[PDB]
Subunit: 480 residues, 4 copies
């Protein structure tokens, strides 16, 4: 599997504490932690020299080689996970997207085949419920029981394509609750967005600004509140993907304070920048920002999202990395509704949070670990195998430099995209060394990776972190 | 029309101020206000003797002789307005309910005929949009232009009967906004209520408690938030009927603080009592409380609703007076979904608010006037004809006694109902004398009324109180 | 008193409704409202020609010729009320400020003498409680009973000068509540501000930016919350002067929703602009913004204050007009704690609100009247004499042009100040004609005024709008018999 | 030190995860965790049989043998820690209270002597800053550096006894922040409470109900908001003791969301019951509830406090166990201000939280551990030595029965008090076995304890959980060059 490796003089930073210790690794696992380790001679030894050592990042939202209209996103499972590793991320969770009226299981097999053959790092899979009926219900059950899936996503947007009704939502959340799965949502109101898009085009607003104006944050907030409400009535845990706005995040905060089982996933884009760039005079640049929900035009938004990720009102971060070329984006040059949706973010996720939340004093290093790996591992039932530096855990570690300062650019990023939405931003905090599966995959700015080295990691239902309260609530007429 | 009448030594209480003055009336109108009025000899003179004189109450939500399954509510336009006058209310606004797929205009004519022939007092009419299509759109326009209607209601509940989709809501609010009408809603989520009713019956909960448990306040709050959101996107003023819960009222408060044009209508029931009585061992008593949305089981609710009516987060009061006999209620004795919905409240509305909000120190007498007549007159475009004691205004006045104390009972109420949901409650504050159309219709506990004396009062669109901001907001691409 | 005057073809805008009618005025009073008025021939007639006619503005917060260290503010009761009238304001309420350990009543007489002799328009007076003891308590009673005062202000700031303790606040609010007066506060925490000033000076931050950084909005919010709490415990109505920050305005909103009797007074400065200009490289410009509480550095502040004035969470507007010359400001050139505090705002108040809340669609014309006159008249017990176009009310009216557009500048303002904190701002909405005491005092951009023409207007205690709930709450304490 | 011990078949429940494993212990420490442990023959073996095994509770607020007017509370460090252990608590943190104008360090030595000689379990000490001056400042430094103290409490109540001013609060929080200590507060407004007490007595309300009516929750909320504000301005972490009311808990929630470093400590009383019993016709019963801040008369309070402990808006639980006899309480029979303040709670703390938050579905077993030990260990810098079942941690463990159901009564409690404020309450969840310092101190309902067995545990300043953000904020003040 993996050679012996010793990291010396490192400061271990887990979500619960930080402490000085050496780390000995072999065959994909952490074997010893402490001082003066009884270790074989001739072991490859890295001198951490007081630098931080954290669990590798888990990016819970990717779209590598995602199909769209006979094309594919430009970062595939190989190049996309190269990008992840370059940024300190050692596990990704991608979305399987079956065509409406097609098999979920057959889609899952396709995605397993693509990723097993190309991923540089360990991965898992969410399965999107793009339509609903009795056979789909059966497949969901089968996928949870037999295929290592515990997370499924529904769409409240994309009217006449993926969108599900309130009756379907109730049916689906009841089912996912009974089976021990996470119920994920893409939460915007598709019915109202459909009208507003028509309204924008009739006003002659065909550029990317038409995208953000046709999807104001009130339509994200409505759909979030409604999802929270249906999930509560069906005793189902809810996970809100791609939290983009202050109002969505406040609804999640509100629901969690009442005791509702609700999680929020901000992304690199909503943590790092705003939507002013939709009004760029450079069409291509503006189209690079087109994603759904969009980036809020309100410039106070990213500081707020970071604040709520710091306080635990939001719990984990993803990227929704979903890159298209300038030529693909330009398909929608005359009509924003035809711009393929998605931006970059996998490489920049951990640096963006360090820069915006840790160097700003909003969160400490332990909460940084929580919001980049450990909470994700707990929610998806991967803890302590992932998201922790502990004996018996997987050898996925990063030597992090808090003092590193790097300018982001399309020129030096691993993505095949020509644009980078964070172009020109100077970020504090970066990885020096990345170890994945016990092997050194980044050092001295050099990537050392193998196509297909990454393993599918099965995720079991009924995560304790998610379901203990649900179960306790389940456990709890007037005779006339 | 109406004989000369002089009220002397009264303390006039309008929404804006209180002051001592005599009031001279003739032919339906207030002619002079002041001291030492130049008045003809031989005028009928009432000695107010320091007592308050307020504008007659406007009850903006009634259902007199409302049809249901070949029956009718037991209080008709005559007996129902007798009840209103006994309680200090001198104008009512009733709901016209066309069958799905039938003409709105034909329904309006029926209701005009019933009320013109029986009402004791002036009235107006809201028209319920029970279904939606091109011909209904046309009728709405015609009714606003030609028939004195400015208020229309849509249902978010009653799946497969009255319920409208989000696309229909957007269409309808856009239309009502363009035409200068108030958009009213019955705001509960019918899709989810349908599931919960099935769930209650499968648990064997067939009594009235199944009604309140199948319609928890979260389902009122969801639908209110969604209506607020669609109304905001379409620049349409929203009016929430039958505010029953703390969470609904808080959403209205929130929206108004942002600047959204939203009004809330608590009712006598939600101001005066809670939903604990759904669990009464007396089936009949419990069924007397069945209304939609239901009374909150949370006993802190009525004090809170009064508080938000006091602070102006809620603006006006109705009753939704909709009475059925015990025999009619008993149709649903084996299945709560078959209990006809509706309770009493028209007679008790003004006394309930005085007792719960004024004698408690939450609101003063001027705000009492506002929330019982003047705000309703402003919203429905009836001010200063109604809701004000002013020269040239209609002679609809009440001599109110703050020190009166009365126990409510089915035995002494004007309603034909056998039950009164406020049975046994002692209320501070009551009318001594009611003058309507310049005629004394209550004195010494005696009603003096004529069937059909009441006039239809046309209500024009584009009320200033409602539409000035809407118009100003209406009045307010990147070239590449 | 005042000649016959007829305004024809006007659209009257009161707080409750708007309607078309002619207005006939004589001897300081509105005599008739309606169509085809029975009127004597030869009456001076103004053609409003569809333009709005509103009640004159009431500015509830001014500091004309306010003394400070042997000097005075540069706009006195004459020039300051010229400024008021030029902007559509026909009544002002100024603050009487007695020196600590001196008589409130003697201070009141000095102020009455200054204003009676110079004011162009009607006025009233608040009295500031700058210190507290038995004789001050007696004077407050006497002033309410005999001198037409119903509003008194206390300071939670200015440690070792004006500041009162929590015991004194309790005593004072109990007393003012018993006597039917409005309890006004200057609400910032003076103990903590003292420390932060020292911290700014030790960091070498001596310019105007040190002023806003030594008084962060948290210190306004703390004092507001504490004043609300003491006022609630003593059944006393509370009025928060100079609402500057979002957080202060949210606490007032929160308290009103619970039923507490609390009023908030934003000022022209907090409605119109933010505090970014404390960091101007021009010292003199930055010092022109120095006022307390300061303008929020958060640029989302003025939009928010306008939003809460629109929704009624805040009820009335003032200016706290308190102007000093550049030479006077420069006394603090080496130390921001020595910059005399105060900015302009009286002339600009009504246009600022129209431009920022009405032309933006946040409030309608009727709420504009409410927040520029009618709510002030109700709170200070001047309604319907002021703040309303009604038969028997005072002839204080403005013909307002919603379509007028004017750039503000020190060059054309009535103030003697060299700086204007709204310099260069283009504002929508302005007065065309101002009538005061039935007399045309502004027309064609010309002022027609007389020194000393203004009358003191006595203000009685126990305003209904303020006290009916307080009284009902007092009317409603049982031991457990054991 | 301590004999070999093996617990088999147990379900370990830490704050982060639960898992099945055997636990081997020797000489005060957990030595091995796992399956098939290499263990010496003849080891005392307990069969957990699938039952939960959790870290022993840490009660961060006790007042054992606290002096008051020449008397003492009736539960001393021995009997009081017997009560603790009976309820699943294996460590207590008590408050050292020096007389005003006396030495903090001398008080600390007295308390160390009392506890070292009587405590059954490990303990630590907070030191209360009952007055403030230069020598007290020096002692605080000395206690942190040399005596294992990292937590100090100030009083915002008790006017003319312990109360500190806003200047003193600023000075004290600045000092505690610089030294790496937790700043604890007793947060009620003492100035206003003094007035309201006098008001209650003048109304003839002398019974216990006068206590809760003279201290309405608004006066707790005001003091909380002010403490948050001063702590924020001085970059000092704040810990709110005895969170009793919904409004206090909402202010802590609000401040934490903004990023302020603020902790809240609900107590057994506020988690388990309300204040309706102040109106009991039995004087003695009512007086048994007298504590400060008092129990809220609002019966929705305890459900809400449990909800905010569940969501993490409040982080840790104490008891403020402070018991007086009926005869001692009765000293205030004619005047509630003379009733000695304090109730029971140490024994009942963990069962109350299980019954009211876990069996109700508000929180899971892992958050239960967090709020009964682990968050306290992190805040006071005792993690992972305490609050965790981990190799190298202290052998303080409890075998917990989720299915146990017990009625609370004065008849069977360990306290010397005649009254129990939870009398008659049936609580779900109880300890079966308690191990402390590796020794079985509760089994089969029998206590096995030794007077003086407990050790003082030094607590170091600059806890990472508390100070990493504070430090980062300090690391991040430019003048405008003109």
């Amino acid at each position: 599997t993996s050679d012996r490796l010793l990291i010396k003089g490192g400061r271990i930073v887990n979500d619960d504490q930080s402490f000085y210790a050496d780390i000995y690794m072999e065959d994909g696992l952490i074997k010893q932690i402490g001082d003066n380790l009884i270790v074989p001679g001739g072991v490859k030894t890295i001198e951490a020299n007081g630098k931080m050592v954290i669990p590798g990042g888990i990016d819970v939202h990717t779209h590598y080689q995602m199909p769209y209209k006979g094309m594919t996103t430009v970062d595939d499972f190989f190049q996309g996970t190269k990008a992840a590793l370059a940024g300190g991320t050692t596990m990704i969770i991608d979305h399987v997207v079956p065509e409406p009226e097609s098999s979920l299981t057959e889609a899952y097999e396709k995605w397993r085949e693509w990723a097993d053959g190309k991923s540089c790092c360990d991965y898992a899979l969410h399965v999107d419920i793009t339509h609903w009926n009795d056979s789909v219900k059966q497949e969901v059950q089968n996928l949870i029981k037999d295929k290592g899936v515990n997370s499924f996503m529904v769409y409240m947007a994309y009217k006449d394509l993926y969108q599900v009704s309130n009756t379907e939502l109730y049916e689906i959340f009841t089912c996912l609750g009974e089976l021990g799965a996470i119920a994920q949502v893409h939460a915007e109101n598709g019915d109202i967005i459909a009208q507003e898009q028509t309204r924008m085009l009739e006003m002659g607003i065909t550029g990317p600004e038409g995208h953000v104006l046709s999807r104001p944050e009130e339509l994200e907030a409505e759909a979030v509140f409604r999802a929270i409400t249906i999930a509560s009535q069906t005793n189902c845990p809810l996970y809100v993907t791609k939290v983009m706005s202050k109002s969505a995040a406040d609804l999640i905060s509100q629901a969690r304070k009442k005791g509702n089982v609700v999680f929020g996933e901000p992304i690199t884009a909503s943590l790092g920048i705003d939507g002013t760039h939709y009004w760029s005079k450079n069409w291509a640049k503006a189209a690079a920002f087109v994603t759904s929900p969009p980036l809020s035009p309100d410039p106070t938004t990213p500081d707020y999202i970071n604040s709520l990720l710091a306080s635990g009102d939001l719990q984990l971060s993803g990227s929704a990395h979903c890159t298209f070329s300038t030529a693909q984006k330009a398909i929608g040059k005359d009509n924003f509704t035809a711009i393929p949706e998605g931006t970059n973010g996998v490489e920049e996720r951990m640096s963006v949070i360090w820069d915006k939340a840790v160097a700003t004093g909003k969160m400490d290093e332990n909460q940084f670990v929580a919001v980049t790996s450990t909470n994700a591992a707990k929610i998806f039932n991967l803890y302590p195998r992932k998201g922790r530096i502990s004996v018996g855990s997987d050898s996925d570690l990063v030597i992090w430099d808090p003092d590193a300062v790097k300018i982001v650019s399309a020129k030096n990023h691993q993505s095949a995209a020509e644009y980078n939405i964070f172009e020109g931003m100077e970020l504090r905090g970066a990885p020096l060394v990345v170890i994945c599966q016990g092997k050194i995959m980044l050092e001295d700015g050099n990537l050392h990776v193998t196509q297909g080295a990454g393993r599918f990691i099965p995720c079991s239902p009924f995560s304790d972190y998610v379901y203990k309260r649900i179960k306790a609530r389940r456990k709890m007429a007037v005779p006339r």
